[PDB]
Amino acid sequence: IDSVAPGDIRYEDLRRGENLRFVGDPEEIHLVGSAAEIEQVLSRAVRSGKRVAVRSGGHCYEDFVANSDVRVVMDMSRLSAVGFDEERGAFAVEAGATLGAVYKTLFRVWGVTLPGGACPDVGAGGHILGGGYGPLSRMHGSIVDYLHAVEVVVVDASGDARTVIATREPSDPNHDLWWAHTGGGGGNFGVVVRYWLRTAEADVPPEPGRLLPRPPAEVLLNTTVWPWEGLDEAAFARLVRNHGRWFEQNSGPDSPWCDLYSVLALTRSQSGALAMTTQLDATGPDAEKRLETYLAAVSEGVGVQPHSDTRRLPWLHSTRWPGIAGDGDMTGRAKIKAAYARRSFDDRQIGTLYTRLTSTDYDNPAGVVALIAYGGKVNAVPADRTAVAQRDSILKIVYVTTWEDPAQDPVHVRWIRELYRDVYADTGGVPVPGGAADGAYVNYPDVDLADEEWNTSGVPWSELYYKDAYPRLQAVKARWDPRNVFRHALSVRVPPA
Template sequence: MGNSPSSLQQCIETVGNGRVGFAGFPSDPLYQITWVKPYNLDVAITPAAVVRPQTAEDISGVVKCAAANNVKIQTKSGGHSYANYGLGGADGAVAIDMVNFQHFSIDNSTWQATIGAGTRLGEVSQKLHDAGGRAMAHGVCPGVGIGGHATIGGLGPMSRMWGSCLDHVLEVEVVTADGKIQRASSSENADLFWALKGAASGFGVITEFVVKTHPEPAHIVQYEYTIAFGSQAEAAPLYSAWQNLIADPALDRRFGSMFIMMPLGAIITGTFYGTEAEFQATGIPKWLPKDAGGAIVINDWLGSLAHDAEKEALYLSDISTPFYSKSLAFKREDLPSADKVKDLFRWVDDQDKGTLLWFIIFDAAGGAIGDVAANATAFAHRDKVLYYQSYAIGLPLTGTTKNFITNFHNQVQAAASPGTYGTYPGYVDPALSDGQQQYWGSNLPLLEQIKLKWDPADLFHNPQSVRPASA
């Protein structure tokens, strides 16, 4: 940026008014380590600035600075974007780090909670628990920030029972592209609110959420089955039986489950929100493996979240690594047959992975998520019953590893029913040529119209965010 500050830097520093720790710039020593902190080390990125505001007024000022200098903006909450989209996804954006937005309160008459957008899910769970044994649906990775999670979907083991995280959002405070601090809900700025619930990265900076909550489940049963074997092909029949279970339209909504492939083994997890007697009465246990590899644990709410996070191998999620990932979403009719599953698992055995740090997660969905119409919010994947995502870490990340993940994805698509399409927008994949269509499906045209109204200059931008419709 030269020896003298740019007009953008001068503007941001004016907003900060001399506060230490308000903003960092590429000229700062250790900028990448202390300010940028990229999540995926395979995606090199240098923002024009990283700002850590303390108030909505700070954000308003920074938004105006970016707009005046024709610089794009993105917001980082937990910072776990697979392609570093919270940092802009490409060089030269202003990244707004919401780390200081940790406020929390709860109304004990309505049990609605107000949560700062920089709060991470582990803290959300703890704060709700401490505020009267309350809870809401969300994922199990404790380091993920609610600012991104609650605006892109937010799926977890309790989502089949309670719906997605964004389905709990009743109102937000948001700074829009004109720098205004606004409220958005179903009755105020309703079109913007609709877009924020599924595609917020293209529409504004949310500072806080007002959410509905539930009483914590009094009883939780957790099932776990670990298999160690010499080949993935041996696990194919087990996977097919599990897939048949989670695809059953009558599957009890209190049950969430994952099947996780990994080197030399697999794990089946199940979480049931009820008593062991109720779990047995559902009939689910008879479809799950019961030999010495299986176990049932009775847990409390916070303990169950910790257990799920551990089994999903995501306690490492706060460690920056070079990694590569692909994913796909399945409707019930898209699911592959047992013969195709067998071929898919056999294919995995024959591949050079280039790393021992890989895993593939199949995650049950459906239930209450599908009770909401696909066009009720920007989140479009209401008809999906299963998601898969592959994830491989390389130290360093090699072409061999990327080819394994990419070719596995191609094999999954070939095994699924023709026309299987779309993926969860939280699993961003910069390699997609039609990312917006895959993320938002039939809701994309309306999103583009709302974008034209609220952000016609495309100030809030990453490589796959919603673009304004042609005027």
């Protein structure tokens, strides 16, 4: 029974993704099992004038799928296969495959991986389309740097749906559709059924073991914690400055430090502690000494000795450690905002962070600003080659608040909005590209970047996410979704006519 309507025991679960702020009201949720099922659902919906959306992993930070207008959901749960497609010479990942399944299959069967996200529950469907990256991206780039081809169901001007395959081959007639899938974002062009991935290096023999990167066999994992109790602004500032300068220096595509990843968590002082998690390739005989060099750089002159715990773990095991994977808790309510950083925070922004993290004004105790190591081999790719236009940044910066009370959304949304606006005040409240920031990342969507009350930079949401990729995305949208069947706040949208 592949349709799910209100009253079905499965409806409460399947009307929602993993973000509990958003409750969808679809008349039907179809657990589709093939391209031909997809074309059937889509043609019927479009002929009937009913708004659609696709869910794969359900990790959307915004209401793109659960939007109250959506009448028909295609849930990709039954399309979760991962394997090696011999007839194409590439690995096939169905849109509903979670990253935990992708990594366990690729690694235990073939000893390879993709430099995708940290959370194992994330789905391929939304993740790859949006420019997925994670712990191994400094070493191996974005997951879209391995996208060889995609199979997507698109809707004609007429309203009927059809299946097409689009590839990286420059002569492929649907090549621009392939390109839009290398960061163009979910819910914009059509329903991805499966992605085909392999290295784009030309010299490589046609063997699965050789067609995607080997991860390090073992890694060093460190946890470092500084108590907040003895920590003044000057100490907080030196720590952020140290960390920022180190990433400014050691993030180039040819840096030996491409094999290091870290997340520095600037937590609310109510939490008791600031913390950092670091992962280093443990292969080379000097790995421990190098890890200590980074850790000593971050703490240098801070005046607060951190607690530090380092363990060596075999690689696949390390991917499920919550220190890297996150804690798995998708209950409660969260608001995410984010930005690219080309350079580290200036002293005035650090002052804003310290005030906002120590203020008793609010008591958002779960609030955090996380600085995620980025760049390295991501930045070897020309900015125009894929739809991930940010190819010279050093960090992704994620601002988070979480809470429990369903009646208290406004105070929590306000806190994070004020914090982000204030950090980015001098560029109209938003991370404007091409300066200290490089705009925003579409898999951390934030409707506020299109809101005139929060964005006073004169730069539209579409340029913050996509920079100069946007006009090429709009040309793909005009060709491939002429009816604008696939849309949401922050969806690629052709120019007004």
